[PDB]
Amino acid sequence: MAEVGEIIEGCRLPVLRRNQDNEDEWPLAEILSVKDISGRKLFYVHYIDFNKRLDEWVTHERLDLKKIQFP
Protein backbone atom coordinates (compact mmCIF):
# COMPACT_ATOMS: atom_id res chain seq x y z
CA MET A 1 0.00 0.00 0.00
CA ALA A 2 0.89 3.69 0.73
CA GLU A 3 4.08 4.79 2.37
CA VAL A 4 5.23 6.91 5.34
CA GLY A 5 6.97 9.51 3.13
CA GLU A 6 3.66 10.27 1.38
CA ILE A 7 2.07 11.51 4.60
CA ILE A 8 1.57 15.26 4.61
CA GLU A 9 -0.30 17.94 6.58
CA GLY A 10 -4.03 17.63 6.10
CA CYS A 11 -3.97 13.86 5.63
CA ARG A 12 -6.60 12.02 7.58
CA LEU A 13 -6.18 8.51 8.86
CA PRO A 14 -6.56 6.28 11.90
CA VAL A 15 -3.99 6.78 14.62
CA LEU A 16 -3.34 4.58 17.65
CA ARG A 17 -4.32 6.26 20.93
CA ARG A 18 -4.54 4.65 24.39
CA ASN A 19 -7.82 5.48 26.01
CA GLN A 20 -8.77 6.19 29.59
CA ASP A 21 -9.03 2.38 30.27
CA ASN A 22 -5.49 1.73 28.78
CA GLU A 23 -6.97 0.06 25.71
CA ASP A 24 -5.90 0.52 22.13
CA GLU A 25 -8.28 2.59 19.94
CA TRP A 26 -7.63 3.86 16.37
CA PRO A 27 -9.72 7.00 16.02
CA LEU A 28 -9.51 9.03 12.89
CA ALA A 29 -7.02 11.88 13.12
CA GLU A 30 -5.72 14.71 11.00
CA ILE A 31 -2.03 15.33 10.41
CA LEU A 32 -1.25 18.84 11.66
CA SER A 33 2.51 18.73 11.24
CA VAL A 34 5.40 16.50 10.05
CA LYS A 35 8.76 16.86 11.71
CA ASP A 36 11.87 15.20 10.31
CA ILE A 37 14.66 16.61 12.49
CA SER A 38 15.37 13.59 14.67
CA GLY A 39 16.32 11.40 11.62
CA ARG A 40 12.94 9.74 11.97
CA LYS A 41 9.53 11.21 11.21
CA LEU A 42 7.27 12.61 13.90
CA PHE A 43 3.63 13.49 13.31
CA TYR A 44 1.50 15.98 15.29
CA VAL A 45 -2.11 14.82 15.16
CA HIS A 46 -5.59 16.03 16.08
CA TYR A 47 -7.99 13.26 17.00
CA ILE A 48 -11.20 14.13 15.28
CA ASP A 49 -14.05 14.97 17.64
CA PHE A 50 -11.62 14.99 20.58
CA ASN A 51 -10.62 18.08 22.44
CA LYS A 52 -7.47 19.91 21.17
CA ARG A 53 -5.89 19.15 24.61
CA LEU A 54 -5.51 15.45 23.51
CA ASP A 55 -3.40 16.22 20.43
CA GLU A 56 -0.23 14.18 20.31
CA TRP A 57 3.10 13.71 18.62
CA VAL A 58 3.43 10.16 17.26
CA THR A 59 5.72 7.91 15.24
CA HIS A 60 4.96 5.95 12.07
CA GLU A 61 4.04 2.70 13.91
CA ARG A 62 0.94 4.40 15.24
CA LEU A 63 -0.38 5.36 11.80
CA ASP A 64 -2.74 3.10 9.88
CA LEU A 65 -1.32 3.72 6.44
CA LYS A 66 -3.80 1.29 4.89
CA LYS A 67 -6.67 3.80 5.21
CA ILE A 68 -5.45 7.26 4.31
CA GLN A 69 -7.25 10.27 2.96
CA PHE A 70 -5.20 12.92 1.22
CA PRO A 71 -6.07 16.67 1.06
Fold of 1-71: SH3 type barrels. (2.30.30)
CB 35 within 8 A of CB 58: no
CA separation for the pair 32, 56 (Å, rounded): 10
Beta bridge partners of 25: 17
CB 57 within 8 A of CB 42: yes
Buried b (16+ CB within 10 A) or exposed e, 22-43: eeeeeebbbbeeeeeeeeebeb
CA–CA dist 18, 13 (Å, integer): 16
CA 58 to chain centre: 6
Contacts of 56 (CB under 8 A, 6+ apart): 17, 44, 45, 47
Domain boundary assignment for the chain: 1-71
Q: Round to whole Å and give the CA distance between 18 and 7.
A: 22
Segment 29-34 long-range contacts (CB within 8 Å, at least 24 positions apart): 31/7, 33/9, 34/7, 34/8, 34/9
